[PDB]
């Protein structure tokens, strides 16, 4: 009965610091530049500016700039999750509540999973998109584009930094040297499917045939549903 609609062609882009060139890759099965990839800016005569005018963009941002939280909606309280979040999560925010953007990832009755990020970061990422003529269809924490095949976790490297997907609605970002501390600051050891060569770290690392983050994202379009484009950032 599944419709199994044919996947949407798109330009997948990962943004991080404004100072660094972004990563991009085209997902357009059957089309001439399918799987083309690159960086921007660059001195190469890149097709990126043309692709930005021809395809919608799925934008990934760094999980290191996000915070993932669970919360319980108080019994009898009829306020929506994103109004409850700033009040309940205030003690877990580095920034003032007014300086923080919240997005809802999942809800099961009273239990909500959210992502918090600085409003200024949202503004700067979206300004960069506009300056590049990128039309974002979703804005997703990068770690949430990784496969979720529990009970194993997933991992990949992007610019030496490890992205580790350890739960359905969150993940971690770590420098190679933190893994021992992070993976053993955690309660127990785990099994990790690694899409980059495994590091010497705690846990059972299973080396998968290597794939880049943007390739993993292209194979996981459902992850587009996990998006920070909510509330004041719902639409340009």
| Segment holding 105, helix H or strand E | strand 100-108
CA gap 144, 186 in Å, rounded? 19
137 binds a second copy (CB under 8 A): yes
130 binds a second copy (CB under 8 A): no
120 binds a second copy (CB under 8 A): no
Contacts of 16-20 with C-beta under 8 Å, sequence gap 24+, read: 16/61, 16/62, 16/159, 18/124, 18/128
- 173 strand-pairing partners: 163
Q: Is 224 left (phi over 0), alpha (psi -120 to 50) or beta?
A: alpha
167 binds a second copy (CB under 8 A): no
162 binds a second copy (CB under 8 A): no
Q: Which residues contact 73 (CB under 8 A, 6 or more apart)?
A: 79, 81, 84, 110, 111, 112
4 binds a second copy (CB under 8 A): yes
Q: Which residue in 100, 154, 196, 227 binds a second copy (CB under 8 A)?
A: 227
The residue (of 219 and 225) whose beta carbon lies closer to a second copy is 225
The answer to whether 45 and 34 are in contact (CB under 8 A) is no
Residue 122: burial class (beta carbons within 10 Å; 0-12, 13-18, 19+)? buried
226 binds a second copy (CB under 8 A): yes
The residue (of 3 and 200) whose beta carbon lies closer to a second copy is 3
Quick one: which segment of 17-25, 77-85, 176-184, 196-204 binds a second copy (CB under 8 A)?
A: 77-85
- 117 strand-pairing partners: 66, 101
Residues 38-67, mask of contacts with a second copy (x by CB under 8 A): ---------------xxxx-----------
The residue (of 12 and 201) whose beta carbon lies closer to a second copy is 12
Name the residues that contact a second copy, by CB under 8 A: 1, 3-6, 8-9, 29-31, 53-56, 80-82, 104-108, 135, 137, 148-150, 168-169, 222-223, 225-227, 229-230, 234-236
């Amino acid at each position: 009965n599944k419709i199994n609609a044919s996947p949407q062609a798109m330009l997948i882009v990962r943004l991080a610091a404004a100072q660094a060139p972004l990563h991009w890759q085209l997902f357009a099965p059957g089309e001439p530049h399918h799987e083309a990839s690159g960086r921007w800016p660059t001195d190469d005569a890149s097709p990126f500016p043309a692709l930005a005018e021809q395809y919608p963009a799925w934008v990934l941002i760094p999980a290191s700039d996000c915070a993932f939280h669970s919360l319980t909606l108080p019994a009898g309280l009829r306020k929506p999750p994103l109004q409850v979040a700033p009040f309940l999560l205030e003690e877990q925010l580095a920034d003032d509540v007014e300086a923080t953007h919240f997005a809802l990832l999942h809800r099961q009755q009273a239990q909500c999973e959210i992502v918090a990020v600085q409003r200024q970061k949202m503004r700067d990422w979206l300004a960069r998109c506009e300056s590049l003529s990128l039309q974002p269809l979703a804005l997703t924490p990068d770690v949430l584009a990784l496969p979720w095949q529990p009970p194993a976790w997933s991992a990949v490297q992007v610019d030496e930094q490890w992205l580790i997907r350890h739960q359905p609605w969150g993940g971690m970002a770590a420098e190679n040297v933190w893994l021992t501390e992070l993976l053993q600051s955690e309660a127990e050891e785990h099994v990790i499917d690694s899409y980059s060569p495994p590091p010497a770290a705690p846990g059972v690392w299973r080396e998968q045939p290597a794939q880049t983050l943007l390739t993993l994202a292209a194979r996981h379009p459902a992850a587009q549903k996990l998006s920070l484009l909510q509330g004041e950032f719902a639409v340009r």
